[PDB]
Amino acid sequence: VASYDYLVIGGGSGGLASARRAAELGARAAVVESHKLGGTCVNVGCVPKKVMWNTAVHSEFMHDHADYGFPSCEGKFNWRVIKEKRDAYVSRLNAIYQNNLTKSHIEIIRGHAAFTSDPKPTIEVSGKKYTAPHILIATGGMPSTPHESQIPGASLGITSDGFFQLEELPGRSVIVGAGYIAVEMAGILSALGSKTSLMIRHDKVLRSFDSMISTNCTEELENAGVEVLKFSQVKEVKKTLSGLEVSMVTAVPGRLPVMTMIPDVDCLLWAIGRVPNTKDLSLNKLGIQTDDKGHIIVDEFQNTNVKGIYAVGDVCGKALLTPVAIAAGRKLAHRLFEYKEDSKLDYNNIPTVVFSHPPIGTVGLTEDEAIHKYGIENVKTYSTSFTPMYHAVTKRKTKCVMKMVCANKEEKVVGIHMQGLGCDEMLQGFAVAVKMGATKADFDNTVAIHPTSSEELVTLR
């Protein structure tokens, strides 16, 4: 039984960040990884998604070429070209992260870890045992898929994982789900030329975001040529002579249900949820608490219910973002190796960008949430809607919407919501100000930058 100061299970964002910080503090750490380092962020998430987004962005801008005095650009996107370059870039990152571990003197244990029956928390990887007074579980999650028992033929569809394996642009694609990943995929496929449908169970996408964003976002998708099938769900899928055939039930409220067949589907993409990766850990051998979805339960300091066992990131099922896993993993290392007992991540005011077209940036409370938190009488919002200067000369148009949620008399800024060109790079610094507890006067007292979209947030009235 080889002993370490810190044993990290999972080599993704959370696991890598925590191990690296602990190593700086003097800990002798090891990272167990069964697949590729970089985990979801590098291999099948953040990075490859962003590259594909940059690609779709090129597609749109190329529609405006003629308006801007250039000659029309004629044609066919070649998926294999960018696919090959994207994969290579991912290969470059795997090698970098491996190097990052080595230079820090972190040992890399390759293989699948599982807890043992042993009294003091001990894991086994490929017959060998390993132990540490501090063990971090950061196994992330995976895409959820329907059971054939509930939706026959479900296994004919792919997930975001399968998306990153595609070698050609699908002619006809149907995306099922209404969350950010669904929105993202539909927008990329559609910009690149796939005939795309997005199938949602209600009337709007991103229903957990501020209602101004869910509304605007659903409209922007339609305007960009994505067919949004509202109040619809898949009843069954089947392999026809040429592609798939999707049976769906549409049940608009105040109406009779109607069954529709969607034929000649090349790609059926499930974007319905993510499941934690805890199933093969043997948690129960130590009685580690999970919820009924398999998520590991932790307190505010990332402690599990077992002493010296912690969990961070997607496996805990809260705020499923790379920077959250990183920050929680870092704070945890300072708590354990620097004896900072108050060291923990504040889960409020975490900013999010959704890579739609145009992109979405959000931080803090939605209008409804502030209304529930402070009372209708104590909530004031400010908002604007405009056409970015970029489109002053284009026939194609996109809008920019911004909303500021204030609370109390002081008008403390408790939430910012926007969609528009530039919003992806604009959010970060306002998130700093929101975190610091700025009020509307703080915003108003900052001189504007002209001409930009960003200045709109500092000149709201």
Ligand X SMILES: Cc1cc2nc3c(=O)[nH]c(=O)nc-3n(C[C@H](O)[C@H](O)[C@H](O)COP(=O)(O)OP(=O)(O)OC[C@H]3O[C@@H](n4cnc5c(N)ncnc54)[C@H](O)[C@@H]3O)c2cc1C
Ligand Y SMILES: N[C@@H](CCC(=O)N[C@@H](CS)C(=O)NCC(=O)O)C(=O)O
Site pattern 318..337 for ligand Y (x: CB under 6 A):
----x---x-----------
Contact 199, 248 (CB under 8 A): yes
Q: Which is nearer to ligand Y, 54 or 378 (CB)?
A: 54
Site pattern 350..389 for ligand Y (x: CB under 6 A):
------------------------------------x-xx
Closest by CA position to 159, among listed 141, 171, 134: 141
Tokens for 358, please give them.
């145009």
Q: Restricting to residues 415-454, name those near ligand X by CB under 6 A.
A: 450
Closest by CA position to 287, among listed 301, 302, 304: 304
Residue 69 makes CB contacts below 8 A (sequence gap 6+) with none
Length of the chain (residues): 461
Establish whether the linkage from the previous residue to 451 is cis, with ω within 30° of 0: yes
Kindly indicate which of the ranges 60-68, 145-153, 343-351, 446-454 contains the residues binding ligand Y, using the contact rule CB under 6 A. 446-454
22 binds a second copy (CB under 8 A): no
Return the amino acid letter for 327: A
Is 420 within any annotated ligand binding site? Answer: no
Q: d(Cα 125, Cα 111) in Å, to the nearest integer?
A: 6
Q: Restricting to residues 173-232, name those near ligand X by CB under 6 A.
A: 181
Q: d(Cα 171, Cα 194) in Å, to the nearest integer?
A: 5
Shortest separation between residue 353's beta carbon and a second copy, angstroms: 5
Active site residue 334: no
Paired with 358 in beta bridges are none
Q: How many residues bind a second copy (CB under 8 A)?
A: 79
Is 10 within any annotated ligand binding site? Answer: no
DSSP-derived pairing of the beta strands 309-311 and 274-276 = unpaired
Q: d(Cα 118, Cα 311) in Å, to the nearest integer?
A: 20
Task: Report the binding-site residues for FAD.
Answer: 13-14, 33, 40-41, 49, 113, 314, 322, 450
Catalytic residues, by residue number, are: 450
Residues that bind ligand Y (CB under 6 A): 13, 16-17, 20, 38, 41-42, 46-47, 93, 96, 100, 322, 326, 386, 388-389, 448, 450-453, 455-456, 459
Residues that bind ligand X (CB under 6 A): 9-15, 32-35, 39-41, 45-46, 49, 112-113, 138-140, 160, 181, 277, 280-281, 313-315, 320-323, 325, 450
